[PDB]
Amino acid sequence: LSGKTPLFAGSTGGLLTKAVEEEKYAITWTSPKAQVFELPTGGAATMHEGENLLYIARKEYGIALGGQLRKFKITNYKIYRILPSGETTFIHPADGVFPEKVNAGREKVRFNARSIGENPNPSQVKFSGKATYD
Amino acid sequence: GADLTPCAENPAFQALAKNARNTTADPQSGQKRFERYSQALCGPEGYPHLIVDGRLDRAGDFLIPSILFLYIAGWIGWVGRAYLQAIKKDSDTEQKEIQLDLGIALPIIATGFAWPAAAVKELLSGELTAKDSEITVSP
Amino acid sequence: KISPVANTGAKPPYTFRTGWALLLLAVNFLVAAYYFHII
Amino acid sequence: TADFLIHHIHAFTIHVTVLILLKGVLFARSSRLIPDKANLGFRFPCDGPGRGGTCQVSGWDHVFLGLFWMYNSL
Amino acid sequence: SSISDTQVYIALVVALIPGLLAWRLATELYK
Amino acid sequence: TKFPKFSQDLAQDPTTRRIWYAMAMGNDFESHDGMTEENLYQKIFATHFGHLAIIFLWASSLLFHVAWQGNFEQWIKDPLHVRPIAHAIWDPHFGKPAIEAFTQAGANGPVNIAYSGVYHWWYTIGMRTNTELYTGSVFLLLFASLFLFAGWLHLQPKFRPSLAWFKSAESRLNHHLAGLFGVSSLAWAGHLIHVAIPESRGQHVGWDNFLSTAPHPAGLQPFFTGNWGVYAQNPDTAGHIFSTSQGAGTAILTFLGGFHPQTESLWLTDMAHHHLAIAVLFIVAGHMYRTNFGIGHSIKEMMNAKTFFGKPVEGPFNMPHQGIYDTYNNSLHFQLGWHLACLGVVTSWVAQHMYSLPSYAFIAKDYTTQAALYTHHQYIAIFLMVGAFAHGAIFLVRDYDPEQNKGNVLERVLQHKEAIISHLSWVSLFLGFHTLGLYVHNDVVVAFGTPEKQILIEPVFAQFIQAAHGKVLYGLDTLLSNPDSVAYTAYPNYANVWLPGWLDAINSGTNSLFLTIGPGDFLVHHAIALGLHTTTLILVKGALDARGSKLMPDKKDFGYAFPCDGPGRGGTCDISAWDSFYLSLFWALNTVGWVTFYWHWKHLGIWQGNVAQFNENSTYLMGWFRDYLWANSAQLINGYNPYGVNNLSVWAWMFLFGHLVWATGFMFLISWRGYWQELIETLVWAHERTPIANLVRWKDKPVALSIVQARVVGLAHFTVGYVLTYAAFLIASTAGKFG
Amino acid sequence: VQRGSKVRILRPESYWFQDVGTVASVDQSGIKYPVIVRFDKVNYAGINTNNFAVDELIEVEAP
Amino acid sequence: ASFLSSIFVPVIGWVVPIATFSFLFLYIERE
Amino acid sequence: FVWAFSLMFLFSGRGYWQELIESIVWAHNKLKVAPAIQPRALSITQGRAVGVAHYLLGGIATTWAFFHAHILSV
Amino acid sequence: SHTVKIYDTCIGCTQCVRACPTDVLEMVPWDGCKAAQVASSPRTEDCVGCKRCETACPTDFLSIRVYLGAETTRSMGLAY
Numbered sequence A: 001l002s003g004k005t006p007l008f009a010g011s012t013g014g015l016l017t018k019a020v021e022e023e024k025y026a027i028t029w030t031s032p033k034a035q036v037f038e039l040p041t042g043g044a045a046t047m048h049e050g051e052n053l054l055y056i057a058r059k060e061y062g063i064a065l066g067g068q069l070r071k072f073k074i075t076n077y078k079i080y081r082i083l084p085s086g087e088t089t090f091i092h093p094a095d096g097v098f099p100e101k102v103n104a105g106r107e108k109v110r111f112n113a114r115s116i117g118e119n120p121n122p123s124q125v126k127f128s129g130k131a132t133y134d
Numbered sequence B: 001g002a003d004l005t006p007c008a009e010n011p012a013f014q015a016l017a018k019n020a021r022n023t024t025a026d027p028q029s030g031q032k033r034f035e036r037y038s039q040a041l042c043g044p045e046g047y048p049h050l051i052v053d054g055r056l057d058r059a060g061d062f063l064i065p066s067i068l069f070l071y072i073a074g075w076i077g078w079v080g081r082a083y084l085q086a087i088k089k090d091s092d093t094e095q096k097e098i099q100l101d102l103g104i105a106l107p108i109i110a111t112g113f114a115w116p117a118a119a120v121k122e123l124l125s126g127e128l129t130a131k132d133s134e135i136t137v138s139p
Numbered sequence C: 001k002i003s004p005v006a007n008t009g010a011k012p013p014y015t016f017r018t019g020w021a022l023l024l025l026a027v028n029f030l031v032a033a034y035y036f037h038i039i
Numbered sequence D: 001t002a003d004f005l006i007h008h009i010h011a012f013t014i015h016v017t018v019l020i021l022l023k024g025v026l027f028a029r030s031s032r033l034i035p036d037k038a039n040l041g042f043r044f045p046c047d048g049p050g051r052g053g054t055c056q057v058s059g060w061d062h063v064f065l066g067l068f069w070m071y072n073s074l
Numbered sequence E: 001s002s003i004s005d006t007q008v009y010i011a012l013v014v015a016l017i018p019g020l021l022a023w024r025l026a027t028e029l030y031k
Numbered sequence F: 001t002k003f004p005k006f007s008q009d010l011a012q013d014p015t016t017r018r019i020w021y022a023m024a025m026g027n028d029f030e031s032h033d034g035m036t037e038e039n040l041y042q043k044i045f046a047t048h049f050g051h052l053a054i055i056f057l058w059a060s061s062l063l064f065h066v067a068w069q070g071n072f073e074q075w076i077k078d079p080l081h082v083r084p085i086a087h088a089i090w091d092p093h094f095g096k097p098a099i100e101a102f103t104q105a106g107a108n109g110p111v112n113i114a115y116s117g118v119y120h121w122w123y124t125i126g127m128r129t130n131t132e133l134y135t136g137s138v139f140l141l142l143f144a145s146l147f148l149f150a151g152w153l154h155l156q157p158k159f160r161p162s163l164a165w166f167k168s169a170e171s172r173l174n175h176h177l178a179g180l181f182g183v184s185s186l187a188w189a190g191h192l193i194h195v196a197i198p199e200s201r202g203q204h205v206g207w208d209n210f211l212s213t214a215p216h217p218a219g220l221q222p223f224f225t226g227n228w229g230v231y232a233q234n235p236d237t238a239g240h241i242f243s244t245s246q247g248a249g250t251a252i253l254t255f256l257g258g259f260h261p262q263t264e265s266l267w268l269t270d271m272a273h274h275h276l277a278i279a280v281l282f283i284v285a286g287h288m289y290r291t292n293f294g295i296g297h298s299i300k301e302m303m304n305a306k307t308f309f310g311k312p313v314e315g316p317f318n319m320p321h322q323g324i325y326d327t328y329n330n331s332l333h334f335q336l337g338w339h340l341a342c343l344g345v346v347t348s349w350v351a352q353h354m355y356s357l358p359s360y361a362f363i364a365k366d367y368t369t370q371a372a373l374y375t376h377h378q379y380i381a382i383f384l385m386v387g388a389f390a391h392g393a394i395f396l397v398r399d400y401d402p403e404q405n406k407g408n409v410l411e412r413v414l415q416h417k418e419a420i421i422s423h424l425s426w427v428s429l430f431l432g433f434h435t436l437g438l439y440v441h442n443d444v445v446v447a448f449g450t451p452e453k454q455i456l457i458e459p460v461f462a463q464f465i466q467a468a469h470g471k472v473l474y475g476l477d478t479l480l481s482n483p484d485s486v487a488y489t490a491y492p493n494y495a496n497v498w499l500p501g502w503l504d505a506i507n508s509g510t511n512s513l514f515l516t517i518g519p520g521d522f523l524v525h526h527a528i529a530l531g532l533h534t535t536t537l538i539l540v541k542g543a544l545d546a547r548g549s550k551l552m553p554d555k556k557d558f559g560y561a562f563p564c565d566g567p568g569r570g571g572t573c574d575i576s577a578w579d580s581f582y583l584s585l586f587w588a589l590n591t592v593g594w595v596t597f598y599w600h601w602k603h604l605g606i607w608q609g610n611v612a613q614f615n616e617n618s619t620y621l622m623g624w625f626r627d628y629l630w631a632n633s634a635q636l637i638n639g640y641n642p643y644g645v646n647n648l649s650v651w652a653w654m655f656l657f658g659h660l661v662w663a664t665g666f667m668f669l670i671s672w673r674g675y676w677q678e679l680i681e682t683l684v685w686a687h688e689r690t691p692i693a694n695l696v697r698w699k700d701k702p703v704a705l706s707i708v709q710a711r712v713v714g715l716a717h718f719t720v721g722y723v724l725t726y727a728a729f730l731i732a733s734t735a736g737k738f739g
Numbered sequence G: 001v002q003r004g005s006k007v008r009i010l011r012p013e014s015y016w017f018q019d020v021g022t023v024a025s026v027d028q029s030g031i032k033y034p035v036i037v038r039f040d041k042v043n044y045a046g047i048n049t050n051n052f053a054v055d056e057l058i059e060v061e062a063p
Numbered sequence H: 001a002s003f004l005s006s007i008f009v010p011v012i013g014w015v016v017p018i019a020t021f022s023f024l025f026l027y028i029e030r031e
Numbered sequence I: 001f002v003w004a005f006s007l008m009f010l011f012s013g014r015g016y017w018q019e020l021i022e023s024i025v026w027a028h029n030k031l032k033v034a035p036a037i038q039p040r041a042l043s044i045t046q047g048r049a050v051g052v053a054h055y056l057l058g059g060i061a062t063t064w065a066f067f068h069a070h071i072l073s074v
Numbered sequence J: 001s002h003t004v005k006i007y008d009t010c011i012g013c014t015q016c017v018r019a020c021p022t023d024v025l026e027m028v029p030w031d032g033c034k035a036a037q038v039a040s041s042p043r044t045e046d047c048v049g050c051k052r053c054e055t056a057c058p059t060d061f062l063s064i065r066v067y068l069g070a071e072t073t074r075s076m077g078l079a080y
């Protein structure tokens, strides 16, 4: 990962021991202009003119931040999951496309080819290791 | 009749009548109140006890109040039911519920004196009840 | 929509329902008759 | 001795009332549980049963809870 | 006025018998 | 982490929720991972044995402390004026003034007075020394150990019963009715005749001499011959003194039908005759079914029958009961939800009788035991009743199969449930607007100094029940009040043997048998009506709507106890059928407030002789507030006054105790989770950022309580404060006055 | 069903189950639930319209 | 035989909770 | 009374009350007294607002009358 | 942890994916002739269970449900 940290004095709201012993998340974005943006956990910060990088505790902070970045006409925001062993994984735009847009590569997952009323009764599925939502 | 006596002969009733505590501006309202309750039945304490059994001797307790209510209450329901049905035929239904169309309501409020006749008419043949099928229901 | 949510299968007189209900009603008046000292 | 206790009781109830009220002010914008609380608004019931449950997490619901401690204090 | 002392100690020894069996019933249920 | 062996999901939980949620469903064998139907029944069958052992061990406790730390032998010589002792106190926290107060009932140490009434129980049955109670103590320990071994045995592989053995329903009814009800009833008449009747008459019968000593002089010749009338020839005279031979008789079975004059309790000879007739019917009742031999009824054939003598008929009473037999057996929650309701009714049935028809000796004059025993059972009647619907809802969510029923009677209820839930609302509303308005009209009217203007109405037709039993006080002159009527003098067979003694009991006025009813009694029964109609409205709704509703049709997929469906669709805060139970338990507790305050205040006027204060002041609600609660709480709050400490110091502490436990629940009900979770996160920050305490750390991540278990914790808090506060007030108000 | 008619839906787990609503449009395609219906009464969410299949709709009145 | 209460009461108040909470705390935290 | 009436809204939830109104709406559509304005249970934050309003009103009004009637006698 | 099941009543409005805070839902192409888009839930491990997706659905009842289940660090929204 490469980028600059946003300029802010620091805050109690931020990374805790989970980042060291468990997963920590990181978010990248590139802005043409330096503006003040509210951080996910309290406070405000400025953003450099190129390759801003921020570390965040959970995945929810990044997309919540990305929604704020979209207000400033920024869309090249990516999120990474950094494990304690240093393994990094590029996740949120898993493909070059965003999730709301459609792309041919993706496949449907846990799609129930029926209406919700057609699900079986629970008594019909007991002591079988299955559920009605299957 | 249970552990009671006629109030006019009950001494505890007469004991309270001397100090009646007139309610309205009329000075004799206290004595007049006890005088008219001389008909009912009081107990040992001296307060009157009504009997809603249905005896014609004591029908003014509950029965006469009963009939006077239901004629009044059915007026309110038949009026509300008819006013609501009249709105549904019109286009702007929800607004008329808040802003009453008095042109439609007061003719309906003029009726209702004969709500029992309209009730039996809808019961014997009409729209007093919708079918169980056409009504909405949970699964 | 396997089973309908509304029942069916009856006719206007309802003999079985009235026959048993009127019996339950006949008892209620017999009890009232003893109270009113009709019997 | 009785007034030493009661005056401390007053300080106890007052501090808790400030705790409920001051918390809603700072955490109305965002929280570790919910970072986008501002977009939902000042007056929302929750964000959902997820995260274990997010019930009475708004700035409004803090005022609702604090009003009970107004009664307990005064 | 009260029961003898010896009768009390006997009841306590008898109480071990449900106890040893209560442990056996419980451990068997966990399995 | 493998603590929940029954669930792998909770074990794979880093949070604290695993510890709380694991405590909950450790008893839910249906949700236990990899539980087959065979192991489910086999595990349930063994658990019953451990439960039965806890009962007998608990009973052994009551017999041991009274023998070792009790005054039963002294209480017999003067039962009315001697207080019974439950057990002894040993608290290092007590001071010298406290020990001085609790040294009561003629004891050499701090001691508790008993209010269960069990001193009156075994005395009537034939116990007269402390050694006899000790033999019962050691007997029940071995009797309990017998069951604990049986539970371990039936979990071993060879002795594990099969699934078909559990579903053999026609057999179980045959043995329970004939054996568990009948033979046990038949046996109890044996003890009454061999042990209780003579020892009430003075003769000491025990294990040493019961084989030699005869209950009746004539022996068994009148029975086996058939001349049964001999046993009822010489009855105990009215002047009989209990546990003595003065005015005694030789009869072992009689039908005197009334109260013993001295003890103000039922004739014990009738109780011997009582259980005889019941055991005969029960044994006769047992043989209905088709256990193995072919002789008897098959429930499945009777319920699936669609043919009367000539006509083709839908079913019994022309109602389709096609698939109810398999539904009852296959689904245990239907059984449990059913059996609790049957037991819940019986529990109230007990309470309604024991104060009116006291069986045991001298309980009628031990006023405190009568009240605690009444409040005991009716509180327990609720949880059994409220608990029945909770399982009836789970059955609809877990075990109910519509394809099996398919036109069943049970299918029809789900089809018109809206009329059931709707009309219940009208009945509840129709009562409360009127029951309150009449209480309020009478309350305001007395406030303005015109009590004559109250709406007092007599409970007319309720006297007709009493007048049909006697009770000349009203003057109705109906069936049994009428000497010339047909029921008074049975025309074909003038065998009204109960009528002479029974009429004397009602028309005495001293006992609590069919007490006088007044106008204040009228309004309270309708309040009790409002409690029961509305409590059913909540439970009936939750069960019938457990499967689905227009707001959340797919409710069966989630389960009985899920928190919510989410904010959308206007908000879904208590959709789950579990939350219907949660709101129902608030009512059922309130009903007994309406029942027991009515019981307690009505009886207090009688025990004190001041019947007028209840008949007059129960109309306006200030009377219940003033004459009952304010006046009777004087001795309680004065339990530990600044000047000294009396024997009622415990109740005052318990009174204020449950007050706190009542209100700590309100936090969990009012304040909800998301506020607390953020508060916890701040504490997690500080502990991870303290200089020295950073060394020690949680292994399970702290997490605020879930939405559902918070509602659980609030009920127990609400209920424990409900139970403890009133018990302290009920006992102290009665014990302080002793009448 | 032809556009403009009134149809009573018989879909369980639907707010307007056993209620009448006007068919606003139909899609001549292979899509499941092609019909589009408009009800006067609103959902708990305030949506007022939802697509259904042909079998669930029965012709109460003509167009 | 009143000395039994001096031994059996505190065992319930101290020895029972200490031993039970001690074993349980290790049992729930086991792996 | 008004204090205890508050506890209806604080303890309960909107999900129950909407389902109860549903069954009641059926009886009206049966007798054709159905309201044109579809009835809905109170919003979540409203049910909390309605409770605290009664909780404080019934609470303060009590000590209001107790303070008055007691001190006015003396 | 939590399961997110999607049903045939989808219409491809995409309001669900826009509402998700953790990006658990993706849009995939429906090979049939219904539309060129139907929802999916591939990254189901990051589901917190906030039910925002259900509030955004325009169906008479949901084309997408969220059946809660086993809890994890990601589902419980714990930053510690």
Ligand code: CL0
Binding pocket: D009, D013, D071, D072, F625, F626, F629, F630, F633, I003, I058, I059, I060, I062, I063, I066
């Ligand atoms: C049998 C049942 C019964 C019940 C359920 C009640 C219930 C109540 N009484 Mg009543 N009483 C009952 C019987 C009763 N009372 C009285 C005489 C009485 C008086 C004179 C007053 C009440 C008050 C009250 C109400 C409290 C006011 C309020 O705001 O609500 C809920 C209350 C709260 C949320 C506040 C909690 C209660 C506190 C603050 C009391 C604790 C005092 C303690 C010393 C402070 C500790 C320290 C701090 C940290 C808390 C409460 C509804 C009134 C009141 O205002 O009391 C506070 C009041 O003035 N009652 C009498 C004798 C006639 C009887 C028999």
Ligand code: CLA
Binding pocket: E016, E019, E020, E022, E023, E026, E027, E029, E030, F003, F004, F005, F006, F022, F023, F024, F026, F027, F043, F047, F050, F051, F054
């Ligand atoms: C009538 C009461 C009762 C009964 C019969 C059971 C029965 C059962 N519970 Mg249980 N439970 C109960 C109440 C009860 N529970 C209550 C009130 C709670 C709290 C809500 C729980 C919480 C709970 C959990 C959390 C779990 C169970 C489990 C189990 C099952 C396995 C055996 C067991 O408990 O481990 C045996 C337990 C012991 C503590 C072993 C020691 C035995 C006793 C307690 C001590 C006896 C020794 C005696 C005092 C000392 C003197 C004798 C000495 C001389 C030797 C079994 C079916 C477990 C399961 O998964 O089911 C398969 C499980 O995980 N239960």
Ligand code: CLA
Binding pocket: F088, F089, F090, F091, F092, F093, F098, F112, F649, F650, F653, H009, H012, H013, H016, H017, H020, H021
């Ligand atoms: C600081 C306050 C305090 C404390 C600590 C105590 C302590 C005690 N009092 Mg006491 N008392 C107090 C104030 C206090 N009192 C006051 C102010 C009064 C009024 C004057 C009294 C009046 C009083 C009387 C009259 C009696 C006591 C008794 C007792 C003893 C009961 C011991 C017992 O049986 O086991 C503990 C008792 C239990 C019931 C167990 C806990 C119950 C919980 C709720 C349920 C159990 C399951 C649990 C939740 C599961 C987790 C644990 C499990 C893993 C093991 C104990 C020494 C009794 C006594 O002498 O001892 C025999 C007695 O008869 N007290």
Ligand code: CLA
Binding pocket: F023, F024, F025, F026, F027, F028, F029, F336, F383, F384, F386, F387, F388, F390, F394, F560, F561, F578, F581, F716, F720, F724
């Ligand atoms: C008598 C027969 C009986 C049987 C066999 C069962 C059995 C069952 N019930 Mg059930 N129930 C019963 C009676 C019964 N109940 C009654 C009478 C009621 C009415 C209150 C209920 C209400 C009820 C509900 C509402 C639910 C069950 C559930 C269940 C299942 C799970 C139990 C569980 O989670 O562990 C038991 C767990 C516990 C934590 C029990 C102990 C908790 C008590 C209240 C603590 C009290 C605090 C303390 C001890 C007091 C301190 C005193 C103070 C002075 C210090 C299980 C099949 C649950 C389920 O999912 O069913 C499938 C469920 O949701 N039942």
Ligand code: CLA
Binding pocket: F092, F093, H009, H010, H012, H013, H014
């Ligand atoms: C239920 C069982 C139980 C029992 C038997 C006791 C017993 C006792 N408590 Mg106690 N307590 C309990 C539960 C119990 N508590 C609970 C549940 C709570 C929570 C509310 C408390 C809270 C509590 C407080 C707050 C206090 C006590 C105190 C006391 C002691 C007062 C004795 C006295 O008259 O003054 C004292 C008389 C004396 C002769 C001096 C006492 C000397 C101590 C007890 C010696 C202990 C030796 C110790 C165990 C050595 C172990 C070493 C070994 C392990 C190597 C007594 C030993 C009081 C105390 O100070 O005790 C020291 C005290 O202040 N308790």
Ligand code: CLA
Binding pocket: F044, F045, F048, F049, F052, F165, F166, F168, F169, F171, F172, F175, F176, F179, F180, F181, F184, F346
């Ligand atoms: C004659 C044969 C016989 C007898 C005596 C029993 C007896 C019993 N069986 Mg059983 N059973 C039998 C045959 C028999 N069974 C057969 C053939 C089968 C196979 C079909 C089964 C299958 C079976 C199962 C599967 C289970 C039992 C269970 C039980 C026990 C129920 C709990 C209990 O104690 O209730 C006692 C009940 C009474 C004493 C009477 C009813 C209660 C009334 C209300 C009381 C009387 C009223 C009176 C006023 C009360 C006053 C009280 C007094 C103190 C003042 C009980 C010990 C259950 C159990 O506990 O597991 C061990 C259980 O799970 N049995």
Ligand code: CLA
Binding pocket: F425, F428, F429, F430, F431, F432, F433, F436, F530, F534, F537, F538, F583, F584, F586, I001, I004, I005, I006, I007, I008, I011, I012, I020
């Ligand atoms: C004293 C407190 C109190 C009161 C009065 C009520 C009253 C009611 N509850 Mg309830 N409830 C309470 C506490 C209370 N609850 C608590 C603590 C809980 C636990 C959460 C519940 C849980 C609960 C559930 C779960 C259910 C109820 C239901 C009901 C209704 C039953 C219908 C009935 O009998 O109508 C009688 C109604 C009354 C006596 C009140 C009418 C109002 C007054 C008398 C007239 C109004 C005029 C007003 C004074 C003037 C306006 C002045 C101006 C300022 C606006 C009724 C409205 C049930 C329901 O609604 O089904 C129909 C239902 O399902 N409640």
Ligand SMILES: CC1=C(/C=C/C(C)=C\C=C\C(C)=C\C=C\C=C(C)\C=C\C=C(C)\C=C\C2=C(C)C(=O)CCC2(C)C)C(C)(C)CCC1
Binding pocket: F059, F063, F122, F133, F135, F136, F137, F139, F140, F187
């Ligand atoms: C075989 C047989 C017959 C012989 C019968 C004979 C010659 C004796 C049989 C006696 C019997 C069948 C005795 C019953 C024994 C059970 C007893 C005695 C105890 C039950 C106690 C219970 C259950 C618990 C009681 C409790 C305790 C312990 C208390 O102390 C307080 C009360 C309570 C809590 C209730 C006859 C010739 C007929 C016919 C041929 C076959």
Ligand SMILES: CC1=C(C/C=C(\C)CCC[C@H](C)CCC[C@H](C)CCCC(C)C)C(=O)c2ccccc2C1=O
Binding pocket: F023, F667, F668, F669, F671, F672, F673, F674, F676, F677, F703, F704, F705, F706, F707, F710
């Ligand atoms: C206070 C509070 C908390 C926080 C409470 C917490 C974290 C519990 C802390 C209590 C600790 C664990 C001590 C409790 C000890 C008990 C006295 C004994 C319990 C042990 C039994 C198993 C015997 C919630 O999480 C919550 C959630 C939803 C609605 C309301 C509330 C709520 O009111």
Ligand SMILES: CC1=C(C/C=C(\C)CCC[C@H](C)CCC[C@H](C)CCCC(C)C)C(=O)c2ccccc2C1=O
Binding pocket: I008, I009, I010, I012, I013, I014, I017, I040, I041, I042, I043, I044, I046, I047, I048
């Ligand atoms: C009772 C209750 C309801 C239901 C309460 C309702 C529906 C209140 C309705 C108040 C009035 C009576 C509605 C009708 C007003 C009429 C216009 C009055 C008729 C006009 C004449 C009086 C003139 C909730 O919605 C709720 C939601 C969340 C938490 C708790 C609760 C809760 O406790």
Ligand code: SF4
Binding pocket: D045, D046, D047, D048, D049, D053, D054, D055, D056, F563, F564, F565, F566, F567, F571, F572, F573, F574, F672, F707, I013, I044
């Ligand atoms: S309990 Fe809280 S989170 Fe759940 S539905 Fe109600 S308001 Fe929303």
Ligand code: SF4
Binding pocket: J006, J009, J010, J011, J012, J013, J014, J015, J016, J017, J039, J056, J057, J058, J059, J063, J064
């Ligand atoms: S919001 Fe729901 S119905 Fe609409 S496209 Fe997404 S999953 Fe399908």
Ligand code: SF4
Binding pocket: D050, J004, J019, J020, J021, J022, J023, J024, J025, J046, J047, J048, J049, J050, J051, J052, J053, J054, J066
């Ligand atoms: S519950 Fe939350 S994370 Fe899961 S699909 Fe809905 S909005 Fe997305």
